Design an enzyme around this catalytic site. Sequence first.
Site, PDB file in Angstrom:
ATOM      1  N   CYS A   1       0.832  -1.273   0.000  1.00  0.00           N
ATOM      2  CA  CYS A   1       0.000   0.000   0.000  1.00  0.00           C
ATOM      3  C   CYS A   1       0.835   1.277   0.000  1.00  0.00           C
ATOM      4  O   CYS A   1       1.447   1.540  -0.984  1.00  0.00           O
ATOM      5  CB  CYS A   1      -1.146  -0.078   1.034  1.00  0.00           C
ATOM      6  SG  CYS A   1      -2.367   1.120   1.177  1.00  0.00           S
TER       7      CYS A   1
ATOM      8  N   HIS B   1       0.052   1.373  -3.529  1.00  0.00           N
ATOM      9  CA  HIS B   1      -1.272   1.934  -3.739  1.00  0.00           C
ATOM     10  C   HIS B   1      -1.169   3.008  -4.816  1.00  0.00           C
ATOM     11  O   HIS B   1      -0.183   3.742  -4.845  1.00  0.00           O
ATOM     12  CB  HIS B   1      -1.837   2.549  -2.460  1.00  0.00           C
ATOM     13  CG  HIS B   1      -3.289   2.872  -2.582  1.00  0.00           C
ATOM     14  ND1 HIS B   1      -3.746   4.048  -3.138  1.00  0.00           N
ATOM     15  CD2 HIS B   1      -4.385   2.128  -2.313  1.00  0.00           C
ATOM     16  CE1 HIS B   1      -5.067   4.030  -3.168  1.00  0.00           C
ATOM     17  NE2 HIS B   1      -5.481   2.874  -2.677  1.00  0.00           N
TER      18      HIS B   1
END
Lengths: 187, 187
Positions: free
Chosen positions: B105, B125
């Site tokens: 992420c 991400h």
Amino acid sequence: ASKRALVILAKGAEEMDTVIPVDVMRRAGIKVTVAGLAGKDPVQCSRDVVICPDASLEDAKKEGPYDVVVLPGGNLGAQNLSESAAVKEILKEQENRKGLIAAICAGPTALLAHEIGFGSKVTTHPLAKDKMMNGGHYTYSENRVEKDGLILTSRGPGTSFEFALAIVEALNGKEVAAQVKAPLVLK
Amino acid sequence: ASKRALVILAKGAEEMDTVIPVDVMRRAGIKVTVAGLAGKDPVQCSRDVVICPDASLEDAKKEGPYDVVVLPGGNLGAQNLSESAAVKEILKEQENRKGLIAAICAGPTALLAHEIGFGSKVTTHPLAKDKMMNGGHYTYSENRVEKDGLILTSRGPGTSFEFALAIVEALNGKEVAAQVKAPLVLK
Ligand SMILES: [Cu+2]
């Protein structure tokens, strides 16, 4: 006002089944109370993740009512939920007021224990099917998420996002669910 | 013997990015240490889930080495990891001993902060891409999980199962990963 969710957290709960719905519901702007079945103390989940509840269930149940009551899975967690008089009272009250009840994995077997939502179509984790179906009080589904009116069920950690987004859709609508979904990088 | 994983848990970590890999790795029989960056105290995650770490990072780093070091995401969590001298030392040691580093992420931006794995293909991400790519020290990928040798990266809560199962495959093999995957009720 904002919708409110009660998540009942017992020893042996599946931590993925617990954390994914809490997180996703909070992304949706739902006020979520993580309530410890046994009290305010830290809860040892099924795979040893330790979660500190926001409140005891004893305290949280006095701050009702909630727009959804959520029961995580985990065999031992669900058994603790099934054996709890407080849980029975909360679920019966929620059913009586026509509020949403959402349960995932082994979680729906607590509905059976407390005689909640008989006659509904439900799903569970595949290994929890026989327990759930004892007596034939529900009709079984293999859908990843099953919603029969105010009884919302799902199958396991791998269906937890779908389950959580179904709760979000039920409470705050399709648009909010879509907006919350996009940043998650789901399929 | 069993493989060992260190998961470094900082305030503001994404709790789904944290709990899914911990749980899945423990299902795989990996000995996982959830280590608190700031100490032994409970950690408030990005969506307010509070997790009690197994140990402080200060203590856990003395119990190395680990077969994988795992960095969860969450913008503020990743920033805390990025600012930590202890994290820098752990990652540099893991890199030096040719051990796996796995980050999800915003988590991979801590690799940039500590100058780890330059020249690797990585994903993050989508919102963390520009931070990760500052200086062009990595090559960017939009794959849901990216593995370039000993640097394993992924994109978000919705890729957390894929990320965790990739760690399991890397440490314990394809068969164990498949066995762990089936009960999860993934796609
Ligand atoms: Cu705690």
